[PDB]
Design an enzyme around this catalytic site. Structure first.
Site, short mmCIF file in Angstrom:
data_model
loop_
_atom_site.label_atom_id
_atom_site.label_comp_id
_atom_site.label_asym_id
_atom_site.label_seq_id
_atom_site.Cartn_x
_atom_site.Cartn_y
_atom_site.Cartn_z
N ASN A 117 0.81 -1.22 0.00
CA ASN A 117 0.00 0.00 0.00
C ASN A 117 0.85 1.29 0.00
O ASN A 117 0.29 2.38 0.12
CB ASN A 117 -0.98 0.01 1.18
CG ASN A 117 -1.81 -1.25 1.30
OD1 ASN A 117 -1.96 -1.81 2.39
ND2 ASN A 117 -2.36 -1.72 0.18
N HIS B 93 2.97 2.31 2.27
CA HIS B 93 3.21 2.80 3.64
C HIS B 93 4.47 2.12 4.21
O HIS B 93 4.80 1.02 3.77
CB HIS B 93 2.03 2.43 4.55
CG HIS B 93 0.79 3.23 4.28
ND1 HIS B 93 0.64 4.51 4.76
CD2 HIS B 93 -0.32 2.89 3.58
CE1 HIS B 93 -0.54 4.92 4.33
NE2 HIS B 93 -1.16 3.98 3.62
N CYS C 152 5.85 7.08 9.71
CA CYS C 152 6.89 7.84 9.03
C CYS C 152 6.56 7.75 7.52
O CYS C 152 6.32 6.66 7.01
CB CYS C 152 8.28 7.28 9.34
SG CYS C 152 9.60 7.89 8.24
#
Ligand SMILES: CCNc1ccc(C)nn1
Ligand SMILES: CCNc1ccc(C)nn1
Lengths: 266, 267
Positions: free
Chosen positions: A188, A190, A225
């Site tokens: 995804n 991330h 992050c």
């Protein structure tokens, strides 16, 4: 890999790969956290969830399951070429969210070589708005959970539920300017939950890594992050060796993670 | 995982893991290069070598096999949950060194989804001095190799043997200040060959990664990056298809560590 006879837990065997081991020829804690992630995804896939464990209500509602805390305790790191059998299961924790647990076992002796517990919360994927979990959402995954409590860390007042304090400046040790690369992202885009473990551990002196083995690790996740963000990893000895960790963004000093590690002399 | 009927090659099946795939839900080129490394390590273990493929003469002499070049060409990246079957074999190239080859196959259809070839040289582990392969060392591993040539890239004019030029400054794109972490080291504490692939690819714009898929990658290895070293990744477009020129160098002195090219086709 398969669900157990009762269908309320999932098991999978993993042969430890050459690139997965450390300087002592045994799986690193990051290979372990990855294997837990893999058996977790496979347990969700085998019960209908084609987003990790996103139910039919959550996909329409734009909601996702997000890690709030991970606690791993290892007794023996499996050797390169050895087979490790992991058992995973989920459990409802009311409106707080879900708890996913694991038991790591040696495939030849059957002995438990480690254990893990994680606490997950639900948030809106468009905004970080934490949610108290609806009653309609619960009923969709509750059928895949044991009803009687089954805890990997059942000890009342154990390490998995202890409050972690914030690291006070200045830190004893630090590893500044850490940027994630593409291999650190999931499907995804991330940052992978395992990367933060690697970043915490990067500030530990090499002399600890060489003379000691990691026993316990507890990681609280506060913020994610982003791809273009830079991170600072801080460590101070609080003592066996015990440490206090803090991950923050190099710029503003914004907290992303906090935790503790416990190490035994080899 | 097992050696074939004749014992001159090794096969292994891998189920593609959730953390191993990219945005398209198919294995990344770094997961592939890792799987090639794993089946290579298992072919050496199944035949006696247990240092990668270090003979009993290479051990006393403090000699090691180091990668000089890696060439990977993929036709279809296996999907998450799919099974990929890889076949690997090693072949002598006289005094130059060894060549290790691979064939990636789909476990359901049997079709070839990719192929790879690597060229390895002999090096003194302490002094880093390269040397030609002696007859005594050669006779120790020649028995595990096919004698008739078997090449993953047999073509008369192929991409796997072409000379790569040095990237001229200034680069079109760059990814500055790359440091390896502990997960980037192998069991001997040296940087993993796969990490350099990731570093080359870090300078490619996200717009290429999103609209194109990696087809060919050729990486020449010149020097190793140490734990405390910092790296700069450089890229310039050299072209329906996109082609690039790559250069990995140490942020400080500008010392070359890697050079290569990538070929991408529109999704
Ligand atoms: C058994 C599949 N259901 C779920 C739900 C939430 C979580 C964190 N894991 N698993
Ligand atoms: C069967 C083991 N023999 C070897 C020798 C060298 C190389 C690079 N690979 N394999």
């Amino acid at each position: 890999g398969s669900l157990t006879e009762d269908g309320l837990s999932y098991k999978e065997k993993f042969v430890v790969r050459s690139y997965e081991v450390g300087s002592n020829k045994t799986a690193t804690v990051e290979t372990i956290a990855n294997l837990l992630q893999e058996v977790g995804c496979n347990h969700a896939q085998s019960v209908g969830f084609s987003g990790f464990a996103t139910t039919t209500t959550m996909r329409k509602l734009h909601l996702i399951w997000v890690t709030a805390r991970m606690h791993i305790e290892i007794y023996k790191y499996p050797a390169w070429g050895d087979v490790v059998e992991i058992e995973t299961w989920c459990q409802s924790e009311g409106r707080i969210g879900t708890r996913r647990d694991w038991i790591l076992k040696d495939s030849v002796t059957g002995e438990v070589t480690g254990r893990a517990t994680s606490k997950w919360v639900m948030m809106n994927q468009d905004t970080r708005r934490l949610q108290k979990v609806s009653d309609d959402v619960r009923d969709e995954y509750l059928v895949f959970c044991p009803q009687e409590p089954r805890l990997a860390f059942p000890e009342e007042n154990n390490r998995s539920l202890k409050k972690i304090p914030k690291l006070e400046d200045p830190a004893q040790y630090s590893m500044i300017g850490l940027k994630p690369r593409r291999a650190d992202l999931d499907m995804n885009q991330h940052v992978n939950n395992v990367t933060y473990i690697g970043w915490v551990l990067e500030s530990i002196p090499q002399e600890i890594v060489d003379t000691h083995e990691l026993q316990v690790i507890t990681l609280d996740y506060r913020r994610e992050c982003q791809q273009d963000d830079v991170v600072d990893s801080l460590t101070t000895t609080t003592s066996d060796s015990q440490f206090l960790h803090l991950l923050r963004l190099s710029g503003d000093g914004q907290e992303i993670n906090r935790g503790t590690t416990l190490w035994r002399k080899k």
